[PDB]
Amino acid sequence: GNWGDQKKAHQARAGVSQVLNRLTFASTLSHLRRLNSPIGRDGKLAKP
């Protein structure tokens, strides 16, 4: 899932590729059609 080179993996993004959650058809669909913002996790701001 590290969208970058192996040597500098930590410098690249994380979670870009995830394991498809095959727990129930609805979950599969939701997963295949999901988004994710690059903003840092748990940011103090609340506009985004």
């Binding site: 095959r22 727990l23 129930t24 058809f25 609805a26 979950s27 599969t28 669909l29 939701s30 997963h31």
Partner: protein, 469 residues
């Protein structure tokens, strides 16, 4: 000359026309409206209704010039309209200049939201909680589940279909692979074990196979050449040659080293007979503690490297017991508190004992009237004998009409009925509210969370107990 994805934005206030063609521009289709009237006339509807017989499809509509993809950056400069007829006939002059008109308002919802019946009758937080909890519902996740060897696959025995389905989920494919059962839910406080967000299930219902699901767990293991002298191989580790060995039964598996299918297993039991030569060390995997399953099938093959690679999956019949986490389609999560036998559950004038009993106090604080509407319409649909509709914005489904229908079957127009104290047989002074309603079962079983410890294994760095069940 211009594909349908391109977008032209006209900036009036400042004379700038900005056209975008690059990818990613999220967009959606809308109907066109020339002056006050749609381009989607009966001709188009007729030709389209005969689709799947000749060749007619969406592309025909897009080409004919009736629909049109507007991207968000262009959506800011179009006087959209909600429904064709209602917002155009003739009234106080609001805008009278619409340019497009949405297909159906309910099409804003997503995938997990859409299966929520009457979402507009619930407070948004509960809709969101339901959206998240839907992804945790059990059922048939894929038809060819018996061929998959995935890890942690749940499957439900009798996944019925919702008695009330939204028109949108017809295309979500939910009705072919449902994730819940229609249960006769009675909102009331029978005994007390369902007071703070908890439910009382019917022991007899469970005995009959109410929500009875199954739990699979796959395993992956292959042999490899550890080193010039080190090497792994499948073989029953005997009591003499193998120095490293566990204090567990090994004869349970056959000589080949792979436990045969349909064999009772329990926690801390050998599932694969891997031994590595140093004489040999028992470097073999065991079933996780507190699993207690039965072996479904054993798969053996060769990986890319060409070594013997085998996969084993164990199934487990998970009877619904107390502590299991259920949830309706409205965010009314809860955990089965206690289970009563049919003799003890209350009953209507006829032998209809509720299958689930939620707390009444869960309704007012959370404002989930949508749940009540679902229950009423479900009772009506059951009696009539056909699935009812719960599309979000319908303008033709109110409570008064649904009640009027229900009153034509000898039932209180509001859905309440007179129950009988299961124990003594005395009527209940208050008229309980009982009806069909679609309930799910989450994967959060109790047996997967219960844990204990008394001087267990210790870490190597700081001599403190380990972490994780």
């Amino acid at each position: 000359i211009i594909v349908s994805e391109v977008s032209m934005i006209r900036d009036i206030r400042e004379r700038e026309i900005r056209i975008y063609t690059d990818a990613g521009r999220i967009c959606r289709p809308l109907l066109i409206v020339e002056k006050q009237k749609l381009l989607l006339k009966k001709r188009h509807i007729d030709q389209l209704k005969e689709r799947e017989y000749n060749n007619y499809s969406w592309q025909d509509l897009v080409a004919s010039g009736v629909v049109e993809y507007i991207d968000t950056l262009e959506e800011e400069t179009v006087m959209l309209a909600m429904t064709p007829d209602d917002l155009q006939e003739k009234e106080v002059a609001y805008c009278s200049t619409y340019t497009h008109c949405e297909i159906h308002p309910s099409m804003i919802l997503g995938v997990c939201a859409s299966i929520i019946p009457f979402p507009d009758h619930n407070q948004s937080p509960r809709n969101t909680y339901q959206s998240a909890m839907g992804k945790q519902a059990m059922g048939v996740y894929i038809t060819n589940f018996h061929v998959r060897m995935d890890t942690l696959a749940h499957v439900l025995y009798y996944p019925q279909k919702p008695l009330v389905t939204t028109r949108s989920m017809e295309y979500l494919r939910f009705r072919e692979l449902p994730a819940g059962i229609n249960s006769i839910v009675a909102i009331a406080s029978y005994t007390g074990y369902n007071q703070e967000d908890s439910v009382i299930m019917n022991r007899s219902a469970v005995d009959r196979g109410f929500f009875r699901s199954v739990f699979y767990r796959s395993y992956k293991e292959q042999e490899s050449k550890k080193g010039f002298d080190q090497e792994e191989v499948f073989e029953k580790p005997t009591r003499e040659t193998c120095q490293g060995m566990r204090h567990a039964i090994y004869d349970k598996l056959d000589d080949d080293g792979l436990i045969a299918p349909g064999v009772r297993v329990s926690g801390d039991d050998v599932i694969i007979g891997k031994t590595v030569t140093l004489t040999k060390r028992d470097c073999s995997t065991f079933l996780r503690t507190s699993e207690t399953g039965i072996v479904d099938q054993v798969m053996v093959t060769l990986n890319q490297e060409g070594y013997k690679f085998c996969k084993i999956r164990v199934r487990s019949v998970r009877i619904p017991q107390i502590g299991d986490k259920f949830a309706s389609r409205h965010g009314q999560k809860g955990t089965c508190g206690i289970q009563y036998r049919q003799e003890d559950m209350p009953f209507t004038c006829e032998g209809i004992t509720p299958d689930i009993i939620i707390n009444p106090h869960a309704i007012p604080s959370r404002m989930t009237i949508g749940h009540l509407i679902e229950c009423l319409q479900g009772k009506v649909s059951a009696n009539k004998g056909e699935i009812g509709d719960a599309t979000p914005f319908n303008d033709a489904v109110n409570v008064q009409k649904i009640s009027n229908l229900l009153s034509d079957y000898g039932y209180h127009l509001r859905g309440n009925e007179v129950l009988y104290n299961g124990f003594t047989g005395r009527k209940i002074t208050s008229q309980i509210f009982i009806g069909p309603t679609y309930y799910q079962r989450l994967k959060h079983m109790v047996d997967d969370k219960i844990h204990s410890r008394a001087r267990g294994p210790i870490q190597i760095l700081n001599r403190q107990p380990m972490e994780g069940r």
